[PDB]
Amino acid sequence: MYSGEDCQNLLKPCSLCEKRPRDGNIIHGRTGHLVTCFHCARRLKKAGASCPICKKEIQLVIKVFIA
Amino acid sequence: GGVCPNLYLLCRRDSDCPGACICRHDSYCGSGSD
Ligand SMILES: [Zn+2]
Ligand SMILES: [Zn+2]
């Protein structure tokens, strides 16, 4: 229910899957980047990769939904 | 210990999520400190 066109770059679904929304956000410290789905974000650090944007270490991931 | 049962929601501000919790821009509600 987003309403801001500048944000359209952030509002994209999971870029790896595009089968599900971007419900995988990566927290590093006090900020986090919304970049993939929850499943991909978990798999990403398992592969040894850090945040794809800022490469700051992934402390945790959260599962967002409207439920 | 500051967690809420529905902390797994996208919130726009602290008042956008139930319970005694705050909202981060990273779509996380709550403050697990204490
Ligand atoms: Zn990041
Ligand atoms: Zn994905």
Curated annotation (Swiss-Prot), chain A:
Domain of life: Eukaryota
Annotated tissue distribution: Expressed in all tissues tested with high levels in thymus.
Induction, per UniProt: Down-regulated by cisplatin (at protein level).
Span list, region Necessary for interaction with USP2: 5-67
Subcellular location as annotated: Nucleus
Modification note: Phosphorylated.
Record motif Nuclear localization signal, residues: 19-22
Cystine pairings recorded for this chain: none
Zn-finger (RING-type) residues: 14-55
Family indicated by similarity: Belongs to the MDM2/MDM4 family.
Subunit structure: Interacts with MDM2. Interacts with TP53, TP73 and USP2. Found in a trimeric complex with USP2, MDM2 and MDM4. Interacts (phosphorylated) with YWHAG; negatively regulates MDM4 activity toward TP53.
Associated clinical condition: Bone marrow failure syndrome 6: A form of bone marrow failure syndrome, a heterogeneous group of life-threatening disorders characterized by hematopoietic defects in association with a range of variable extra-hematopoietic manifestations. BMFS6 is an autosomal dominant form characterized by intermittent neutropenia, lymphopenia, or anemia associated with hypocellular bone marrow, and increased susceptibility to cancer.
Record's comment describing the protein's domains: Region I is sufficient for binding TP53 and inhibiting its G1 arrest and apoptosis functions. It also binds TP73. Region II contains most of a central acidic region and a putative C4-type zinc finger. The RING finger domain which coordinates two molecules of zinc mediates the heterooligomerization with MDM2.
Function: Along with MDM2, contributes to TP53 regulation. Inhibits p53/TP53- and TP73/p73-mediated cell cycle arrest and apoptosis by binding its transcriptional activation domain. Inhibits degradation of MDM2. Can reverse MDM2-targeted degradation of TP53 while maintaining suppression of TP53 transactivation and apoptotic functions.
Protein name in the entry: Protein Mdm4
Naturally occurring in which organism (per UniProt): Homo sapiens
Gene for this chain: MDM4
